[PDB]
Design a protein around this ligand. Structure first.
Ligand SMILES: CCN[C@@](C)(c1ccc(F)cc1)c1cnc(N2CCN(c3ncnn4cc(-c5cnn(C)c5)cc34)CC2)nc1
Length: 299
Protein backbone atom coordinates (compact mmCIF):
# COMPACT_ATOMS: atom_id res chain seq x y z
CA UNK A 1 0.00 0.00 0.00
CA UNK A 2 1.56 3.26 -1.19
CA UNK A 3 -0.36 5.20 1.45
CA UNK A 4 -3.31 5.12 3.80
CA UNK A 5 -5.33 6.65 0.94
CA UNK A 6 -5.19 3.39 -1.05
CA UNK A 7 -7.51 0.77 0.44
CA UNK A 8 -8.32 -2.79 -0.59
CA UNK A 9 -12.01 -3.03 -1.53
CA UNK A 10 -13.28 -6.10 0.32
CA UNK A 11 -16.44 -7.47 -1.36
CA UNK A 12 -17.64 -8.87 1.98
CA UNK A 13 -17.83 -5.30 3.34
CA UNK A 14 -19.85 -3.99 0.40
CA UNK A 15 -23.61 -3.39 0.78
CA UNK A 16 -26.07 -5.76 -0.85
CA UNK A 17 -27.83 -4.20 -3.85
CA UNK A 18 -31.53 -5.00 -3.43
CA UNK A 19 -31.98 -4.98 -7.22
CA UNK A 20 -30.95 -8.64 -6.93
CA UNK A 21 -33.80 -9.36 -4.51
CA UNK A 22 -36.49 -11.61 -5.99
CA UNK A 23 -39.78 -12.46 -4.22
CA UNK A 24 -39.79 -15.97 -2.80
CA UNK A 25 -43.26 -16.72 -4.18
CA UNK A 26 -42.20 -16.09 -7.78
CA UNK A 27 -40.04 -19.21 -7.55
CA UNK A 28 -41.11 -22.84 -8.07
CA UNK A 29 -38.59 -25.41 -6.84
CA UNK A 30 -38.17 -28.45 -9.07
CA UNK A 31 -35.91 -31.46 -9.40
CA UNK A 32 -32.53 -31.76 -7.69
CA UNK A 33 -29.57 -30.83 -9.90
CA UNK A 34 -26.84 -31.45 -7.33
CA UNK A 35 -26.84 -32.45 -3.68
CA UNK A 36 -24.48 -32.60 -0.74
CA UNK A 37 -24.43 -33.28 2.98
CA UNK A 38 -25.83 -29.85 3.90
CA UNK A 39 -26.68 -28.17 0.58
CA UNK A 40 -28.20 -28.69 -2.83
CA UNK A 41 -28.95 -27.04 -6.17
CA UNK A 42 -32.45 -27.51 -7.58
CA UNK A 43 -34.01 -26.60 -10.89
CA UNK A 44 -36.45 -23.70 -10.69
CA UNK A 45 -39.01 -21.67 -12.60
CA UNK A 46 -38.96 -17.89 -12.04
CA UNK A 47 -42.09 -15.85 -12.78
CA UNK A 48 -41.36 -12.22 -13.58
CA UNK A 49 -37.58 -12.38 -13.21
CA UNK A 50 -36.97 -11.49 -16.88
CA UNK A 51 -38.98 -9.18 -19.11
CA UNK A 52 -37.83 -11.13 -22.16
CA UNK A 53 -38.81 -14.40 -20.43
CA UNK A 54 -41.68 -13.87 -17.96
CA UNK A 55 -41.58 -17.61 -17.13
CA UNK A 56 -37.95 -18.72 -17.35
CA UNK A 57 -36.15 -21.86 -16.22
CA UNK A 58 -33.36 -21.27 -13.69
CA UNK A 59 -31.32 -23.13 -11.08
CA UNK A 60 -31.49 -22.40 -7.35
CA UNK A 61 -28.64 -22.94 -4.89
CA UNK A 62 -29.91 -23.45 -1.34
CA UNK A 63 -28.96 -25.03 1.97
CA UNK A 64 -30.67 -28.02 3.52
CA UNK A 65 -32.15 -27.76 7.03
CA UNK A 66 -29.20 -29.97 7.95
CA UNK A 67 -26.93 -26.95 7.31
CA UNK A 68 -25.75 -25.24 10.49
CA UNK A 69 -24.49 -21.64 10.38
CA UNK A 70 -20.96 -22.44 9.17
CA UNK A 71 -22.29 -23.25 5.70
CA UNK A 72 -24.92 -20.52 6.11
CA UNK A 73 -22.38 -17.72 6.57
CA UNK A 74 -20.43 -18.95 3.53
CA UNK A 75 -23.48 -19.02 1.24
CA UNK A 76 -23.98 -15.35 2.08
CA UNK A 77 -20.30 -14.79 1.28
CA UNK A 78 -20.63 -16.65 -2.02
CA UNK A 79 -23.41 -14.21 -2.90
CA UNK A 80 -21.27 -11.14 -2.13
CA UNK A 81 -18.54 -12.36 -4.48
CA UNK A 82 -20.97 -13.00 -7.34
CA UNK A 83 -22.64 -9.59 -6.95
CA UNK A 84 -19.31 -7.74 -7.02
CA UNK A 85 -17.86 -9.86 -9.85
CA UNK A 86 -20.15 -8.60 -12.59
CA UNK A 87 -21.33 -10.72 -15.52
CA UNK A 88 -19.34 -12.68 -18.07
CA UNK A 89 -20.21 -15.00 -20.95
CA UNK A 90 -18.38 -18.01 -19.46
CA UNK A 91 -19.63 -17.76 -15.86
CA UNK A 92 -22.94 -19.11 -14.62
CA UNK A 93 -24.23 -15.63 -13.96
CA UNK A 94 -26.26 -14.57 -10.96
CA UNK A 95 -29.88 -13.73 -11.78
CA UNK A 96 -31.32 -12.92 -8.36
CA UNK A 97 -31.50 -13.97 -4.74
CA UNK A 98 -33.97 -14.53 -1.91
CA UNK A 99 -32.14 -13.06 1.09
CA UNK A 100 -34.94 -11.62 3.25
CA UNK A 101 -37.35 -13.37 5.62
CA UNK A 102 -35.78 -16.84 5.40
CA UNK A 103 -33.01 -19.08 4.09
CA UNK A 104 -30.69 -17.74 1.41
CA UNK A 105 -31.59 -18.68 -2.18
CA UNK A 106 -29.08 -17.98 -4.96
CA UNK A 107 -30.64 -17.95 -8.44
CA UNK A 108 -28.34 -18.71 -11.37
CA UNK A 109 -28.63 -19.47 -15.07
CA UNK A 110 -29.86 -22.92 -16.00
CA UNK A 111 -27.38 -24.72 -18.25
CA UNK A 112 -29.09 -27.07 -20.68
CA UNK A 113 -26.52 -29.87 -21.04
CA UNK A 114 -25.17 -30.09 -17.47
CA UNK A 115 -21.66 -30.65 -16.20
CA UNK A 116 -18.74 -31.51 -18.46
CA UNK A 117 -17.97 -34.80 -16.69
CA UNK A 118 -21.35 -36.38 -17.49
CA UNK A 119 -21.56 -34.60 -20.86
CA UNK A 120 -18.40 -36.32 -22.08
CA UNK A 121 -19.34 -39.74 -20.68
CA UNK A 122 -22.46 -39.62 -22.86
CA UNK A 123 -20.58 -38.58 -26.01
CA UNK A 124 -17.74 -41.12 -25.72
CA UNK A 125 -19.00 -43.30 -28.58
CA UNK A 126 -19.66 -40.22 -30.72
CA UNK A 127 -15.93 -39.46 -30.53
CA UNK A 128 -14.45 -41.67 -33.27
CA UNK A 129 -21.37 -35.52 -33.20
CA UNK A 130 -18.71 -34.53 -30.69
CA UNK A 131 -15.39 -33.73 -32.39
CA UNK A 132 -11.92 -32.75 -31.20
CA UNK A 133 -12.69 -29.16 -32.24
CA UNK A 134 -15.46 -29.13 -29.62
CA UNK A 135 -12.98 -30.04 -26.87
CA UNK A 136 -10.75 -27.17 -27.99
CA UNK A 137 -13.72 -24.79 -27.81
CA UNK A 138 -14.40 -25.94 -24.25
CA UNK A 139 -10.69 -25.50 -23.50
CA UNK A 140 -10.68 -21.96 -24.90
CA UNK A 141 -13.82 -20.70 -23.15
CA UNK A 142 -12.70 -21.85 -19.69
CA UNK A 143 -9.46 -19.94 -20.25
CA UNK A 144 -11.43 -16.78 -21.02
CA UNK A 145 -13.65 -17.18 -17.96
CA UNK A 146 -10.67 -17.75 -15.68
CA UNK A 147 -9.03 -14.70 -17.26
CA UNK A 148 -12.13 -12.81 -16.10
CA UNK A 149 -11.93 -14.21 -12.56
CA UNK A 150 -8.21 -13.43 -12.37
CA UNK A 151 -8.81 -9.88 -13.61
CA UNK A 152 -11.15 -9.43 -10.62
CA UNK A 153 -8.48 -10.87 -8.27
CA UNK A 154 -10.83 -13.82 -7.71
CA UNK A 155 -9.32 -17.23 -6.93
CA UNK A 156 -11.71 -20.07 -7.74
CA UNK A 157 -9.83 -22.76 -5.72
CA UNK A 158 -12.03 -25.55 -7.14
CA UNK A 159 -11.63 -25.47 -10.92
CA UNK A 160 -12.49 -28.86 -12.44
CA UNK A 161 -14.68 -30.50 -15.06
CA UNK A 162 -17.55 -31.09 -12.61
CA UNK A 163 -17.71 -27.31 -12.05
CA UNK A 164 -17.79 -26.53 -15.79
CA UNK A 165 -21.28 -26.47 -17.28
CA UNK A 166 -22.51 -26.41 -20.88
CA UNK A 167 -25.36 -24.08 -21.85
CA UNK A 168 -27.40 -23.39 -24.97
CA UNK A 169 -25.25 -22.90 -28.05
CA UNK A 170 -22.40 -24.93 -26.52
CA UNK A 171 -21.30 -21.99 -24.35
CA UNK A 172 -19.01 -23.01 -21.49
CA UNK A 173 -19.84 -21.56 -18.06
CA UNK A 174 -17.83 -21.88 -14.83
CA UNK A 175 -19.85 -22.44 -11.67
CA UNK A 176 -19.64 -23.03 -7.90
CA UNK A 177 -17.92 -20.13 -6.11
CA UNK A 178 -18.30 -21.65 -2.64
CA UNK A 179 -14.53 -21.89 -2.22
CA UNK A 180 -13.83 -18.70 -4.19
CA UNK A 181 -11.61 -16.27 -2.28
CA UNK A 182 -10.69 -12.71 -3.07
CA UNK A 183 -6.91 -12.74 -3.05
CA UNK A 184 -5.48 -11.99 0.40
CA UNK A 185 -12.78 -28.87 5.26
CA UNK A 186 -12.58 -31.46 2.49
CA UNK A 187 -10.35 -30.36 -0.38
CA UNK A 188 -10.07 -31.43 -4.07
CA UNK A 189 -6.43 -32.42 -3.77
CA UNK A 190 -6.15 -34.05 -7.20
CA UNK A 191 -6.83 -30.60 -8.69
CA UNK A 192 -4.69 -28.65 -6.19
CA UNK A 193 -1.20 -27.28 -6.73
CA UNK A 194 1.54 -28.47 -4.33
CA UNK A 195 1.86 -25.04 -2.67
CA UNK A 196 -1.90 -25.17 -2.12
CA UNK A 197 -1.79 -28.64 -0.55
CA UNK A 198 1.39 -28.06 1.44
CA UNK A 199 1.43 -24.31 2.18
CA UNK A 200 -2.30 -23.40 2.07
CA UNK A 201 -1.34 -20.93 -0.68
CA UNK A 202 -4.08 -20.27 -3.24
CA UNK A 203 -3.37 -17.87 -6.11
CA UNK A 204 -4.58 -17.39 -9.66
CA UNK A 205 -1.40 -19.36 -10.39
CA UNK A 206 -2.76 -22.35 -8.46
CA UNK A 207 -5.96 -22.08 -10.51
CA UNK A 208 -3.72 -22.57 -13.56
CA UNK A 209 -2.52 -25.86 -12.07
CA UNK A 210 -6.16 -26.91 -11.67
CA UNK A 211 -6.77 -25.73 -15.24
CA UNK A 212 -4.17 -28.28 -16.32
CA UNK A 213 -6.00 -31.05 -14.46
CA UNK A 214 -9.23 -29.89 -16.10
CA UNK A 215 -7.50 -30.10 -19.48
CA UNK A 216 -6.61 -33.72 -18.74
CA UNK A 217 -10.24 -34.43 -17.83
CA UNK A 218 -11.54 -32.97 -21.09
CA UNK A 219 -9.13 -34.85 -23.37
CA UNK A 220 -9.59 -38.10 -21.47
CA UNK A 221 -13.32 -37.61 -22.16
CA UNK A 222 -14.16 -37.41 -18.47
CA UNK A 223 -11.45 -39.49 -16.86
CA UNK A 224 -10.45 -39.56 -13.22
CA UNK A 225 -7.15 -37.70 -12.63
CA UNK A 226 -4.36 -39.96 -11.39
CA UNK A 227 -6.51 -43.06 -12.00
CA UNK A 228 -5.93 -45.92 -9.58
CA UNK A 229 -3.87 -43.75 -7.22
CA UNK A 230 -5.04 -43.31 -3.65
CA UNK A 231 -4.07 -39.99 -2.08
CA UNK A 232 -1.61 -40.96 0.66
CA UNK A 233 1.90 -40.09 1.84
CA UNK A 234 3.29 -41.79 -1.26
CA UNK A 235 0.99 -39.72 -3.50
CA UNK A 236 2.14 -36.50 -1.83
CA UNK A 237 5.76 -37.63 -2.28
CA UNK A 238 5.24 -38.21 -6.01
CA UNK A 239 3.49 -34.86 -6.56
CA UNK A 240 6.24 -33.05 -4.66
CA UNK A 241 9.09 -34.91 -6.37
CA UNK A 242 7.69 -33.97 -9.78
CA UNK A 243 5.30 -36.71 -10.84
CA UNK A 244 2.79 -35.70 -13.50
CA UNK A 245 0.14 -37.61 -15.41
CA UNK A 246 0.90 -39.16 -18.78
CA UNK A 247 -0.74 -37.70 -21.86
CA UNK A 248 -4.40 -38.76 -22.19
CA UNK A 249 -5.63 -40.82 -25.09
CA UNK A 250 -6.96 -38.11 -27.40
CA UNK A 251 -4.84 -35.05 -26.63
CA UNK A 252 -2.30 -33.82 -29.16
CA UNK A 253 1.30 -32.92 -28.39
CA UNK A 254 0.40 -29.22 -28.46
CA UNK A 255 -2.39 -29.80 -25.94
CA UNK A 256 -0.29 -31.95 -23.60
CA UNK A 257 2.36 -29.22 -23.84
CA UNK A 258 -0.17 -26.84 -22.25
CA UNK A 259 -0.82 -29.16 -19.29
CA UNK A 260 2.95 -29.50 -18.77
CA UNK A 261 3.38 -25.73 -18.50
CA UNK A 262 0.34 -25.56 -16.20
CA UNK A 263 1.92 -28.15 -13.88
CA UNK A 264 5.26 -26.35 -13.51
CA UNK A 265 6.54 -26.73 -9.96
CA UNK A 266 7.48 -23.03 -9.72
CA UNK A 267 4.11 -21.21 -9.61
CA UNK A 268 5.45 -18.18 -11.52
CA UNK A 269 6.62 -20.33 -14.46
CA UNK A 270 3.01 -21.32 -15.18
CA UNK A 271 1.42 -19.27 -17.99
CA UNK A 272 -1.25 -16.65 -17.51
CA UNK A 273 -4.86 -17.29 -18.47
CA UNK A 274 -4.37 -14.50 -21.02
CA UNK A 275 -1.43 -16.34 -22.62
CA UNK A 276 -3.34 -19.61 -22.29
CA UNK A 277 -6.19 -18.08 -24.29
CA UNK A 278 -3.69 -16.90 -26.92
CA UNK A 279 -2.17 -20.38 -27.26
CA UNK A 280 -5.51 -22.17 -27.66
CA UNK A 281 -6.59 -19.47 -30.13
CA UNK A 282 -3.83 -20.61 -32.50
CA UNK A 283 -5.09 -24.21 -32.30
CA UNK A 284 -8.59 -23.23 -33.51
CA UNK A 285 -9.92 -21.84 -36.81
CA UNK A 286 -9.81 -18.12 -37.44
CA UNK A 287 -13.55 -18.21 -38.06
CA UNK A 288 -13.88 -19.34 -34.43
CA UNK A 289 -12.17 -16.24 -33.02
CA UNK A 290 -14.53 -13.85 -34.82
CA UNK A 291 -17.44 -16.18 -34.01
CA UNK A 292 -16.62 -15.89 -30.29
CA UNK A 293 -16.25 -12.11 -30.00
CA UNK A 294 -19.62 -11.77 -31.75
CA UNK A 295 -21.23 -13.97 -29.09
CA UNK A 296 -19.29 -12.15 -26.36
CA UNK A 297 -20.42 -8.79 -27.78
CA UNK A 298 -24.15 -9.57 -28.00
CA UNK A 299 -24.22 -10.99 -24.45
C1 LIG B 1 -19.84 -26.46 -2.35
C2 LIG B 1 -20.70 -27.15 -3.41
N1 LIG B 1 -21.58 -28.15 -2.81
C3 LIG B 1 -22.97 -28.14 -3.21
C4 LIG B 1 -23.55 -29.48 -2.76
C5 LIG B 1 -23.74 -27.03 -2.44
C6 LIG B 1 -25.03 -26.69 -2.83
C7 LIG B 1 -25.74 -25.69 -2.14
C8 LIG B 1 -25.17 -25.04 -1.05
F1 LIG B 1 -25.88 -24.07 -0.38
C9 LIG B 1 -23.89 -25.38 -0.64
C10 LIG B 1 -23.18 -26.38 -1.33
C11 LIG B 1 -23.22 -28.04 -4.75
C12 LIG B 1 -23.57 -29.17 -5.50
N2 LIG B 1 -23.79 -29.06 -6.82
C13 LIG B 1 -23.68 -27.88 -7.44
N3 LIG B 1 -23.90 -27.69 -8.89
C14 LIG B 1 -24.97 -28.55 -9.40
C15 LIG B 1 -25.92 -27.85 -10.38
N4 LIG B 1 -25.19 -27.12 -11.40
C16 LIG B 1 -26.09 -26.50 -12.37
N5 LIG B 1 -26.27 -25.17 -12.34
C17 LIG B 1 -27.10 -24.57 -13.25
N6 LIG B 1 -27.74 -25.31 -14.17
N7 LIG B 1 -27.55 -26.68 -14.20
C18 LIG B 1 -28.12 -27.61 -15.06
C19 LIG B 1 -27.64 -28.84 -14.70
C20 LIG B 1 -27.99 -30.17 -15.39
C21 LIG B 1 -27.67 -31.44 -14.93
N8 LIG B 1 -28.15 -32.32 -15.83
N9 LIG B 1 -28.74 -31.60 -16.84
C22 LIG B 1 -29.39 -32.20 -18.02
C23 LIG B 1 -28.66 -30.31 -16.60
C24 LIG B 1 -26.79 -28.66 -13.64
C25 LIG B 1 -26.76 -27.28 -13.35
C26 LIG B 1 -24.42 -26.05 -10.79
C27 LIG B 1 -23.93 -26.32 -9.36
N10 LIG B 1 -23.35 -26.80 -6.77
C28 LIG B 1 -23.12 -26.82 -5.45
Amino acid sequence: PDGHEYIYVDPMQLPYDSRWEFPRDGLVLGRVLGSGAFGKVVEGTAYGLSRSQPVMKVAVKMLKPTARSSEKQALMSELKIMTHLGPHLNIVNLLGACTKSGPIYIIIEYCFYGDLVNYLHKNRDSFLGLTLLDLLSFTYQVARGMEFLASKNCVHRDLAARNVLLAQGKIVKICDFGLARDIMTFLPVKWMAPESIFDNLYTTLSDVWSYGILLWEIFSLGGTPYPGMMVDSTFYNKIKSGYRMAKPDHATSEVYEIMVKCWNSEPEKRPSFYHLSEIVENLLPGQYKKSYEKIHLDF
